Structure 1
Amino acid sequence: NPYNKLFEERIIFLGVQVDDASANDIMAQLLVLESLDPDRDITMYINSPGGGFTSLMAIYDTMQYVRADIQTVCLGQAASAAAVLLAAGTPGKRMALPNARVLIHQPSLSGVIQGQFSDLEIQAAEIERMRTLMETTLARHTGKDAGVIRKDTDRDKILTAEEAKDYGIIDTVLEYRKLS
Structure 2
Amino acid sequence: ILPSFIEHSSFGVKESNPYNKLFEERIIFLGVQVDDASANDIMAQLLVLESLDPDRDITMYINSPGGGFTSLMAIYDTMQYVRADIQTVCLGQAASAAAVLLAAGTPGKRMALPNARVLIHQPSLSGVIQGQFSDLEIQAAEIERMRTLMETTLARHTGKDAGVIRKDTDRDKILTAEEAKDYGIIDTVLEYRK
**TM bucket normalised to smaller:** over 0.9
Please name the residue that 1:69 is paired with: 85
Q: How many residues align?
A: 178
Q: TM-score under structure 2 normalisation?
A: 0.91
Please name the residue that 1:28 is paired with: 44
Q: For residues 55 and 116 of structure 2, what CA distance do their matches in structure 1 show? A: 28
Is 1:101 aligned with 2:117? Answer: yes
Residues 104-146 of structure 1, C-alpha deviation per residue, up to 9 Å, x if partnerless? 1001112111111111111111111111110010011000001
**Counterpart of 2:54 in 1: which secondary structure?**
coil
Q: For residues 14 and 154 of structure 1, what CA distance do their matches in structure 2 show? A: 26
**Higher CA-based Rg:** 2
Q: For residues 142 and 20 of structure 1, what CA distance do their matches in structure 2 show? A: 26
**Counterpart of 1:108 in 2: which secondary structure?**
coil
Where does structure 2 lack aligned partners over 5 or more consecutive residues?
A: 1-16
Q: For residues 122 and 108 of structure 1, what CA distance do their matches in structure 2 show? A: 16
RMSD: 0.6
Runs of 4+ with deviation above 3 angstroms:
none
Where does structure 1 lack aligned partners over 5 or more consecutive residues?
A: none
Q: For residues 159 and 137 of structure 2, what CA distance do their matches in structure 1 show? A: 31
**Counterpart of 2:106 in 1: which secondary structure?**
coil
User: CA shift at 1:87, angstroms?
Assistant: 0.4
Residues 59-99 of structure 1, C-alpha deviation per residue, up to 9 Å, x if partnerless? 00000010010000001010010000000100000010111
**Counterpart of 1:109 in 2: which secondary structure?**
coil
User: CA shift at 1:50, angstroms?
Assistant: 0.2
User: CA shift at 1:23, angstroms?
Assistant: 0.2
Is 1:43 aligned with 2:59? Answer: yes
**Counterpart of 2:162 in 1: which secondary structure?**
coil
User: CA shift at 1:56, angstroms?
Assistant: 0.1
